[PDB]
Amino acid sequence: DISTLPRVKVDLVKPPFVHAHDQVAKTGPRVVEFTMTIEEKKLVIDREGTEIHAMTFNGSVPGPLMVVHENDYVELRLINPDTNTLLHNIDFHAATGALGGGALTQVNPGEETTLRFKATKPGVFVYHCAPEGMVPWHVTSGMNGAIMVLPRDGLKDEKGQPLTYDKIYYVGEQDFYVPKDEAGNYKKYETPGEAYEDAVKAMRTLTPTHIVFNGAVGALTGDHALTAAVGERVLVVHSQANRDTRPHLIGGHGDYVWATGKFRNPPDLDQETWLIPGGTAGAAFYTFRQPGVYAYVNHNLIEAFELGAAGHFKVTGEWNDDLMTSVVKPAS
Amino acid sequence: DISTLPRVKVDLVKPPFVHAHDQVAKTGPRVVEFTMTIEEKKLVIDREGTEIHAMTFNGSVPGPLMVVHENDYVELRLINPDTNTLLHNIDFHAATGALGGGALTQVNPGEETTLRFKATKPGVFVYHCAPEGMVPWHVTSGMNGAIMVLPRDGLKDEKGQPLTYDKIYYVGEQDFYVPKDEAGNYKKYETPGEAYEDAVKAMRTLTPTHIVFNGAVGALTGDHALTAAVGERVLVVHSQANRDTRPHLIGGHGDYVWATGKFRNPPDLDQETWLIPGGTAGAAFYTFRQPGVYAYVNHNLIEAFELGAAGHFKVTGEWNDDLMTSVVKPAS
Amino acid sequence: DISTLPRVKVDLVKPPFVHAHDQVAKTGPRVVEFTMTIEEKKLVIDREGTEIHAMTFNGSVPGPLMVVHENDYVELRLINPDTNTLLHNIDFHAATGALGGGALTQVNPGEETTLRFKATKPGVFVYHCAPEGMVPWHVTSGMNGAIMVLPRDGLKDEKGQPLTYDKIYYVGEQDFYVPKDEAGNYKKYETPGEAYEDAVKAMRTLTPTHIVFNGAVGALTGDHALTAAVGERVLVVHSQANRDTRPHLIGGHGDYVWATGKFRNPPDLDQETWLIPGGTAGAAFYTFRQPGVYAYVNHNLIEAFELGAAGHFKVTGEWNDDLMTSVVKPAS
Ligand SMILES: O=N[O-]
Ligand SMILES: O=N[O-]
Ligand SMILES: O=N[O-]
Ligand SMILES: O=N[O-]
Ligand SMILES: O=N[O-]
Ligand SMILES: O=N[O-]
Ligand SMILES: O=N[O-]
Ligand SMILES: O=N[O-]
Ligand SMILES: O=N[O-]
Ligand SMILES: O=N[O-]
Ligand SMILES: O=N[O-]
Ligand SMILES: O=N[O-]
Ligand SMILES: O=N[O-]
Ligand SMILES: O=N[O-]
Ligand SMILES: O=N[O-]
Ligand SMILES: [Cu+2]
Ligand SMILES: [Cu+2]
Ligand SMILES: [Cu+2]
Ligand SMILES: [Cu+2]
Ligand SMILES: [Cu+2]
Ligand SMILES: [Cu+2]
């Protein structure tokens, strides 16, 4: 009887940060209550000032990472304020039935709904908006995030031993398809209905104009670089709701990787790069061994360095000359 | 001595259906006899009426699924009637030697041939036409299918326990490259030789115009939706002879997935989405838990909803409110 | 104390050949000394005579395969002669820290440097140039190769039994983005600085003009076909520093495949085709069972047969009619 279970209210945080949770479940199964408010908003996505009309869960691209344990119930109150213009819904790849929830969560502006589903499978999973007939437009406008369903006894390695992270980050990777005129400059639009056909045309090229982490070129750099210390164990959850990606930590590895995100499977060890298929979340665990700057990229390096799919870690601590050293510095 | 083995003649069926077979082999090794007749034919592939000249095995895109057991012999009589115009052959990725058979099966119009090969490796595998110098043109004109080589003791899970499907479907995914003029409309051609250079030009864009299941937009919908009941175990074989895909059951999962199709490997568990590389067949096993409509898609959602890579399941049975429910239906 | 370890100097060979090494380590850990000299040079990459300005390690595309054992130290002397024009460096995906070495190895023309790193993880790994702000340009100009870090006790199968190759080949796959004018012909450039913006424009299409093995269309064919004999065990290392590929041996299989290249993981068995993500090296082991010509391809068959991603094996020995035979040769 679900009414007999504890309820716990989660207050979400903005990516790449993740709301507080316990890796090993400290309670029995619970109804975990989340609220998200849809926000349609202008977002500047590149250094040139390109501005799009983003469609967001909770004001961010990606939407926030939700975290529960296997066999918890996820109860989401989804709010579509009357300041928005479009119909929206939500599909959880973690859920079973009704198109992941999408068939049950269609909200016009000025409406809300509450969905509950049982998180029966452990893993990281995409969630995204999916209104009938408009699905890729909403997803590729930024309306996607992820949910992590932890095993009740936390993560395990390929031998069944515990893997415990000290820090977790959520990197959402977004492909945008900003319409171009025949000279190649972006077009802008006066209403969503006036934008729709050229959004479809742009999408049908299958060639993103921008591929970004955390909603914009450079978002995970500078004062917003990811951080760690030598010796810290970091889990990086990475999602891509629409297109394949191939994450890579420049100067590091994925020590344990669930490339397709599902924790009942043993992780892949020692990865340089891994393929997260479009429509999937994956997760990589790494223990930092060296300080300094790292780049975390999609290793289509054009996508990373020309289109935006690159962020940084800043790692503090002691340099290990046994692992790497300059024997003779560059010289004539 | 192969002449001492039983022969069994298989009568193939049109995809997405699969000819009758036994999961666990009820006999010793056999020579399994198949016949396919090549048919070049016009096919309408979209709702707009776009018509291409398809190149088919047995009149369908994809060609039919062949099913044998490991260490059976596959004996294929391949017929190229004189009503066709082109040379064709067949390459089985299940086979060993002679370019998968292609070097031994070149048939002009008005010819036939018979190939035998031993199915030494269990899995689902692509087969496709591959005439020297014209390979991607034939494949991307629809001339590809798949063969399933079952282990003699049927499928097994990651722990070695049996996995028995109640139903099986074969979804062939086809990328088409319909030539476009500089305004973007499709061109049509008067002979295959007159079409060849612009087919090559279209292919070299690496951007399909259409990506379809079972040969056309919407083919696996309406009266031709896939079906199941709550509690039924379904295997979905999915092939893509030329380009990567990322299948996903919207509202469901791949409970056990051989993404790259080879049954000696343990399946991946609990997948949301999986990557089937171009040139591969994969297979996903799912037990339905909820009734209703599901969409089965390539989860590049542009490819699914704009280019055609989407089909439906219609599932009968009882709704489980424990797994999912609307707590508060959409309202003001 | 690294100074107490043996040093061994390796003399590299041109791909697809691989310098001599032992699979099972015959010594304790060593400092393995390599030297590479960067060469910027013109290369003709197709049958039409298209000529690009390639950026190479050691004069080849790909750069040579380096081979060490786990927990050896790799000490690379990297030389940038004054006959080159550009700044270069090197990033090893096998290494830990300093962007894989790139932060420590920036060499102007007329400079050299020596980097040492400990090869702590077994696998095949990409290495590539990565100068800040110019990364995809150098990589997609050919400036990438691979390193194999063997387990000290050699390769093992999924059950922990030895896998010993008789021959090894290194296939580097290169995506080139030759700039096109609005009629579609390639452009040529008078200096690297004058080429840079249109190189970036070409790359941003995400559509390679050429995808080649060993630096050119047809490079691994004819007198330069790969060779083997029936019964020989062959390891094919395959890298792609920037874009996904899907290798396939036409007429064969990958009997044991590390698609993402890391030997602590069990190999995938019986693969037809496998996905090597951009930014990764993979390795496939096969025992030949039939003589004749094989094609080794990227199984996007457009990429293989139209853009260049195809090579050949020529295999000597006895034909096995049990595995495959023509029962009735093509006839009227
Ligand atoms: O708790 N049964 O899904
Ligand atoms: O968190 N200690 O494994
Ligand atoms: O190529 N990714 O959908
Ligand atoms: O080494 N990563 O580009
Ligand atoms: O979902 N396996 O990582
Ligand atoms: O039955 N030997 O392949
Ligand atoms: O088919 N019964 O497992
Ligand atoms: O991107 N698939 O070949
Ligand atoms: O949830 N599938 O788009
Ligand atoms: O081929 N492994 O699914
Ligand atoms: O040998 N420690 O990396
Ligand atoms: O090299 N003999 O296994
Ligand atoms: O589609 N490969 O990057
Ligand atoms: O069978 N390979 O194209
Ligand atoms: O890296 N696993 O092949
Ligand atoms: Cu929406
Ligand atoms: Cu989805
Ligand atoms: Cu054909
Ligand atoms: Cu093939
Ligand atoms: Cu360089
Ligand atoms: Cu790299």
Tab-separated table of N, CA and C in Angstrom, chain C residues 159-261:
chain	number	residue	atom	x	y	z
C	159	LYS	N	37.171	-16.370	-20.836
C	159	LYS	CA	37.324	-17.337	-19.786
C	159	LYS	C	38.677	-17.253	-19.092
C	160	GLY	N	39.502	-16.294	-19.457
C	160	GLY	CA	40.827	-16.192	-18.861
C	160	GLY	C	41.914	-17.055	-19.480
C	161	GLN	N	41.633	-17.707	-20.607
C	161	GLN	CA	42.624	-18.552	-21.302
C	161	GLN	C	43.452	-17.655	-22.251
C	162	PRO	N	44.694	-18.028	-22.566
C	162	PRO	CA	45.475	-17.188	-23.467
C	162	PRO	C	44.903	-17.052	-24.873
C	163	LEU	N	45.111	-15.874	-25.433
C	163	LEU	CA	44.883	-15.613	-26.865
C	163	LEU	C	46.196	-15.077	-27.392
C	164	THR	N	46.800	-15.785	-28.344
C	164	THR	CA	48.098	-15.448	-28.896
C	164	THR	C	47.965	-15.213	-30.365
C	165	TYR	N	48.302	-14.009	-30.813
C	165	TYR	CA	48.240	-13.740	-32.239
C	165	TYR	C	49.548	-14.131	-32.920
C	166	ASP	N	49.416	-14.591	-34.156
C	166	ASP	CA	50.552	-14.870	-35.024
C	166	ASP	C	51.014	-13.659	-35.782
C	167	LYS	N	50.062	-12.788	-36.139
C	167	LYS	CA	50.323	-11.551	-36.869
C	167	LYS	C	49.501	-10.439	-36.267
C	168	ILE	N	49.999	-9.221	-36.409
C	168	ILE	CA	49.268	-8.023	-35.997
C	168	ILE	C	49.386	-6.981	-37.073
C	169	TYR	N	48.271	-6.304	-37.308
C	169	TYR	CA	48.223	-5.132	-38.196
C	169	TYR	C	47.555	-3.983	-37.484
C	170	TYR	N	47.972	-2.772	-37.852
C	170	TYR	CA	47.395	-1.532	-37.348
C	170	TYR	C	46.760	-0.776	-38.519
C	171	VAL	N	45.423	-0.701	-38.471
C	171	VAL	CA	44.648	0.085	-39.421
C	171	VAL	C	44.216	1.386	-38.752
C	172	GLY	N	44.826	2.483	-39.196
C	172	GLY	CA	44.357	3.791	-38.788
C	172	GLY	C	43.351	4.282	-39.807
C	173	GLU	N	42.191	4.719	-39.344
C	173	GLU	CA	41.147	5.275	-40.203
C	173	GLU	C	41.105	6.774	-40.011
C	174	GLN	N	41.190	7.500	-41.129
C	174	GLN	CA	41.267	8.957	-41.116
C	174	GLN	C	40.096	9.559	-41.883
C	175	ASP	N	39.357	10.426	-41.203
C	175	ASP	CA	38.388	11.314	-41.800
C	175	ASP	C	39.060	12.613	-42.197
C	176	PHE	N	38.966	12.955	-43.483
C	176	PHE	CA	39.456	14.220	-43.994
C	176	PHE	C	38.262	15.083	-44.384
C	177	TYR	N	38.468	16.392	-44.294
C	177	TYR	CA	37.438	17.399	-44.572
C	177	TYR	C	38.027	18.387	-45.561
C	178	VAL	N	38.146	17.969	-46.820
C	178	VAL	CA	38.785	18.809	-47.801
C	178	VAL	C	37.804	19.924	-48.203
C	179	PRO	N	38.179	21.192	-48.044
C	179	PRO	CA	37.213	22.259	-48.369
C	179	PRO	C	36.767	22.234	-49.810
C	180	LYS	N	35.457	22.459	-49.928
C	180	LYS	CA	34.739	22.519	-51.177
C	180	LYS	C	34.213	23.924	-51.435
C	181	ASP	N	34.282	24.286	-52.708
C	181	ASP	CA	33.642	25.482	-53.205
C	181	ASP	C	32.147	25.184	-53.395
C	182	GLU	N	31.341	26.210	-53.696
C	182	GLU	CA	29.906	25.972	-53.937
C	182	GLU	C	29.583	25.030	-55.174
C	183	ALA	N	30.466	24.793	-56.186
C	183	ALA	CA	30.163	23.697	-57.132
C	183	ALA	C	30.523	22.288	-56.660
C	184	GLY	N	31.268	22.192	-55.568
C	184	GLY	CA	31.662	20.920	-55.002
C	184	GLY	C	33.078	20.483	-55.268
C	185	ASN	N	33.907	21.298	-55.937
C	185	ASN	CA	35.299	20.896	-56.176
C	185	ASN	C	36.218	21.238	-54.998
C	186	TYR	N	37.289	20.521	-54.734
C	186	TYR	CA	38.128	20.906	-53.607
C	186	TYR	C	38.907	22.186	-53.840
C	187	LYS	N	38.972	22.929	-52.783
C	187	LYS	CA	39.918	24.020	-52.815
C	187	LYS	C	41.331	23.699	-52.320
C	188	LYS	N	42.282	24.483	-52.822
C	188	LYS	CA	43.667	24.406	-52.415
C	188	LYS	C	44.091	25.752	-51.842
C	189	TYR	N	45.145	25.708	-51.043
C	189	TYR	CA	45.543	26.859	-50.262
C	189	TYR	C	47.042	27.062	-50.311
C	190	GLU	N	47.431	28.309	-50.112
C	190	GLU	CA	48.795	28.745	-50.362
C	190	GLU	C	49.632	28.745	-49.076
C	191	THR	N	48.969	28.858	-47.913
C	191	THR	CA	49.624	28.762	-46.607
C	191	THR	C	48.629	28.139	-45.622
C	192	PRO	N	49.128	27.597	-44.499
C	192	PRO	CA	48.208	27.022	-43.509
C	192	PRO	C	47.288	28.074	-42.905
C	193	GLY	N	47.780	29.290	-42.712
C	193	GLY	CA	46.977	30.355	-42.139
C	193	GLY	C	45.868	30.752	-43.081
C	194	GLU	N	46.118	30.728	-44.395
C	194	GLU	CA	45.090	31.056	-45.378
C	194	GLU	C	44.054	29.912	-45.494
C	195	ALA	N	44.432	28.703	-45.080
C	195	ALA	CA	43.554	27.558	-45.177
C	195	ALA	C	42.665	27.407	-43.952
C	196	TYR	N	43.072	28.009	-42.835
C	196	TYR	CA	42.462	27.670	-41.550
C	196	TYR	C	40.939	27.894	-41.483
C	197	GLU	N	40.429	29.050	-41.913
C	197	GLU	CA	38.993	29.317	-41.754
C	197	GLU	C	38.154	28.357	-42.597
C	198	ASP	N	38.559	28.094	-43.825
C	198	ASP	CA	37.778	27.153	-44.633
C	198	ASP	C	38.034	25.717	-44.134
C	199	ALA	N	39.208	25.387	-43.548
C	199	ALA	CA	39.250	24.095	-42.877
C	199	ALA	C	38.211	24.002	-41.790
C	200	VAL	N	38.069	25.044	-40.987
C	200	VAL	CA	37.063	25.032	-39.928
C	200	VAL	C	35.656	24.920	-40.500
C	201	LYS	N	35.367	25.701	-41.546
C	201	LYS	CA	34.071	25.590	-42.195
C	201	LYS	C	33.793	24.173	-42.699
C	202	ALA	N	34.796	23.561	-43.347
C	202	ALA	CA	34.622	22.211	-43.846
C	202	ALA	C	34.371	21.215	-42.719
C	203	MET	N	35.146	21.344	-41.646
C	203	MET	CA	34.963	20.456	-40.494
C	203	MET	C	33.571	20.606	-39.899
C	204	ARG	N	33.080	21.847	-39.803
C	204	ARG	CA	31.790	22.106	-39.178
C	204	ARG	C	30.602	21.504	-39.923
C	205	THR	N	30.788	21.087	-41.180
C	205	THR	CA	29.737	20.335	-41.877
C	205	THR	C	29.533	18.948	-41.257
C	206	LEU	N	30.521	18.461	-40.506
C	206	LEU	CA	30.521	17.110	-39.921
C	206	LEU	C	30.433	16.024	-40.984
C	207	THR	N	30.765	16.351	-42.232
C	207	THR	CA	30.653	15.406	-43.325
C	207	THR	C	32.024	15.245	-43.959
C	208	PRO	N	32.726	14.154	-43.664
C	208	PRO	CA	34.024	13.976	-44.305
C	208	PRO	C	33.897	13.875	-45.809
C	209	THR	N	34.918	14.364	-46.492
C	209	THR	CA	35.038	14.189	-47.943
C	209	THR	C	35.673	12.876	-48.304
C	210	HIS	N	36.529	12.365	-47.396
C	210	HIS	CA	37.296	11.157	-47.584
C	210	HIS	C	37.372	10.465	-46.235
C	211	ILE	N	37.317	9.135	-46.230
C	211	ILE	CA	37.537	8.353	-45.012
C	211	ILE	C	38.414	7.197	-45.477
C	212	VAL	N	39.670	7.138	-45.021
C	212	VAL	CA	40.651	6.254	-45.638
C	212	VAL	C	41.380	5.451	-44.575
C	213	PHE	N	41.904	4.315	-45.007
C	213	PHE	CA	42.800	3.500	-44.196
C	213	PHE	C	44.216	3.734	-44.650
C	214	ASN	N	45.127	3.877	-43.687
C	214	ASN	CA	46.541	4.005	-44.007
C	214	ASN	C	46.792	5.174	-44.955
C	215	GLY	N	45.988	6.245	-44.854
C	215	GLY	CA	46.301	7.504	-45.464
C	215	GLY	C	45.816	7.783	-46.854
C	216	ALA	N	45.205	6.822	-47.546
C	216	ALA	CA	44.752	7.087	-48.914
C	216	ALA	C	43.750	6.050	-49.340
C	217	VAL	N	42.893	6.399	-50.288
C	217	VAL	CA	42.020	5.419	-50.931
C	217	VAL	C	42.899	4.315	-51.479
C	218	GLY	N	42.510	3.068	-51.226
C	218	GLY	CA	43.219	1.947	-51.798
C	218	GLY	C	44.584	1.634	-51.182
C	219	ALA	N	44.975	2.308	-50.110
C	219	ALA	CA	46.302	2.091	-49.584
C	219	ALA	C	46.559	0.654	-49.170
C	220	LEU	N	45.554	-0.028	-48.655
C	220	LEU	CA	45.684	-1.424	-48.193
C	220	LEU	C	45.127	-2.424	-49.190
C	221	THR	N	45.508	-2.218	-50.450
C	221	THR	CA	45.074	-3.078	-51.526
C	221	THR	C	46.242	-3.318	-52.467
C	222	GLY	N	46.055	-4.277	-53.384
C	222	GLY	CA	47.070	-4.611	-54.374
C	222	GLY	C	48.309	-5.142	-53.722
C	223	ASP	N	49.464	-4.579	-54.080
C	223	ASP	CA	50.727	-5.007	-53.512
C	223	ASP	C	50.835	-4.717	-52.029
C	224	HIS	N	49.952	-3.857	-51.538
C	224	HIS	CA	49.902	-3.512	-50.122
C	224	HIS	C	48.674	-4.060	-49.408
C	225	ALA	N	48.013	-5.059	-49.976
C	225	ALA	CA	46.970	-5.806	-49.227
C	225	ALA	C	47.597	-6.445	-47.989
C	226	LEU	N	46.812	-6.547	-46.936
C	226	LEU	CA	47.180	-7.344	-45.764
C	226	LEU	C	47.196	-8.798	-46.128
C	227	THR	N	48.003	-9.606	-45.446
C	227	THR	CA	48.109	-11.019	-45.790
C	227	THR	C	47.968	-11.908	-44.588
C	228	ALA	N	47.526	-13.127	-44.848
C	228	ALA	CA	47.474	-14.144	-43.822
C	228	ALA	C	47.357	-15.484	-44.500
C	229	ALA	N	47.440	-16.528	-43.688
C	229	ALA	CA	47.236	-17.904	-44.139
C	229	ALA	C	46.093	-18.525	-43.340
C	230	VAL	N	45.424	-19.502	-43.927
C	230	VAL	CA	44.398	-20.244	-43.226
C	230	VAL	C	45.056	-20.826	-41.968
C	231	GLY	N	44.341	-20.676	-40.849
C	231	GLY	CA	44.806	-21.127	-39.569
C	231	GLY	C	45.574	-20.122	-38.764
C	232	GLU	N	45.957	-19.002	-39.368
C	232	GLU	CA	46.690	-17.978	-38.621
C	232	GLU	C	45.755	-17.105	-37.829
C	233	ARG	N	46.248	-16.759	-36.643
C	233	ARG	CA	45.569	-15.912	-35.692
C	233	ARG	C	46.065	-14.493	-35.906
C	234	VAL	N	45.148	-13.573	-36.219
C	234	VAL	CA	45.502	-12.194	-36.564
C	234	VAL	C	44.816	-11.240	-35.638
C	235	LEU	N	45.584	-10.289	-35.098
C	235	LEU	CA	45.023	-9.159	-34.371
C	235	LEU	C	45.041	-7.937	-35.266
C	236	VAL	N	43.885	-7.314	-35.432
C	236	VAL	CA	43.790	-6.058	-36.164
C	236	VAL	C	43.433	-4.967	-35.182
C	237	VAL	N	44.386	-4.067	-34.944
C	237	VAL	CA	44.157	-2.863	-34.139
C	237	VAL	C	43.610	-1.810	-35.086
C	238	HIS	N	42.575	-1.108	-34.676
C	238	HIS	CA	41.921	-0.119	-35.531
C	238	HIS	C	41.676	1.116	-34.715
C	239	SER	N	42.084	2.285	-35.196
C	239	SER	CA	41.850	3.500	-34.444
C	239	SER	C	41.105	4.512	-35.278
C	240	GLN	N	40.410	5.396	-34.568
C	240	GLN	CA	39.724	6.533	-35.212
C	240	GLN	C	39.751	7.631	-34.173
C	241	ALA	N	40.583	8.645	-34.386
C	241	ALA	CA	40.806	9.672	-33.387
C	241	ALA	C	39.675	10.705	-33.287
C	242	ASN	N	38.771	10.739	-34.262
C	242	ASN	CA	37.806	11.824	-34.326
C	242	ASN	C	36.362	11.425	-34.605
C	243	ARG	N	36.099	10.236	-35.149
C	243	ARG	CA	34.755	9.926	-35.605
C	243	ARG	C	34.525	8.434	-35.451
C	244	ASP	N	33.297	8.060	-35.174
C	244	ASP	CA	32.941	6.652	-35.005
C	244	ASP	C	33.226	5.870	-36.281
C	245	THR	N	33.581	4.611	-36.092
C	245	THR	CA	33.659	3.673	-37.200
C	245	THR	C	33.111	2.350	-36.747
C	246	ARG	N	32.876	1.481	-37.730
C	246	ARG	CA	32.245	0.178	-37.502
C	246	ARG	C	32.934	-0.873	-38.341
C	247	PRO	N	34.093	-1.382	-37.866
C	247	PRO	CA	34.827	-2.336	-38.691
C	247	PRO	C	34.104	-3.649	-38.881
C	248	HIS	N	34.460	-4.270	-40.011
C	248	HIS	CA	33.859	-5.527	-40.454
C	248	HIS	C	34.831	-6.188	-41.413
C	249	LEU	N	35.054	-7.481	-41.203
C	249	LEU	CA	35.841	-8.311	-42.128
C	249	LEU	C	34.880	-9.080	-43.021
C	250	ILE	N	34.798	-8.688	-44.284
C	250	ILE	CA	33.848	-9.309	-45.209
C	250	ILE	C	34.296	-10.721	-45.545
C	251	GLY	N	33.461	-11.687	-45.148
C	251	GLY	CA	33.778	-13.095	-45.223
C	251	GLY	C	34.312	-13.681	-43.955
C	252	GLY	N	34.520	-12.835	-42.938
C	252	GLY	CA	35.015	-13.302	-41.657
C	252	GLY	C	34.230	-12.696	-40.520
C	253	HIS	N	34.872	-12.636	-39.356
C	253	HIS	CA	34.303	-12.171	-38.106
C	253	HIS	C	35.389	-11.569	-37.277
C	254	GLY	N	34.974	-10.917	-36.178
C	254	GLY	CA	35.870	-10.689	-35.051
C	254	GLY	C	35.590	-11.780	-34.034
C	255	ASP	N	36.465	-12.792	-33.976
C	255	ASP	CA	36.218	-13.873	-33.034
C	255	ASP	C	36.216	-13.399	-31.584
C	256	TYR	N	37.155	-12.496	-31.275
C	256	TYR	CA	37.248	-11.844	-29.963
C	256	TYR	C	37.491	-10.383	-30.265
C	257	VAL	N	36.633	-9.506	-29.746
C	257	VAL	CA	36.751	-8.088	-30.052
C	257	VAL	C	36.716	-7.264	-28.783
C	258	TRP	N	37.687	-6.384	-28.623
C	258	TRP	CA	37.633	-5.307	-27.613
C	258	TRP	C	37.293	-4.059	-28.388
C	259	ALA	N	35.987	-3.808	-28.543
C	259	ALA	CA	35.548	-2.737	-29.428
C	259	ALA	C	36.028	-1.384	-28.972
C	260	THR	N	36.074	-1.197	-27.663
C	260	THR	CA	36.586	0.025	-27.083
C	260	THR	C	37.973	-0.174	-26.511
C	261	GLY	N	38.617	-1.277	-26.847
C	261	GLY	CA	40.080	-1.422	-26.791
C	261	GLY	C	40.765	-1.734	-25.498
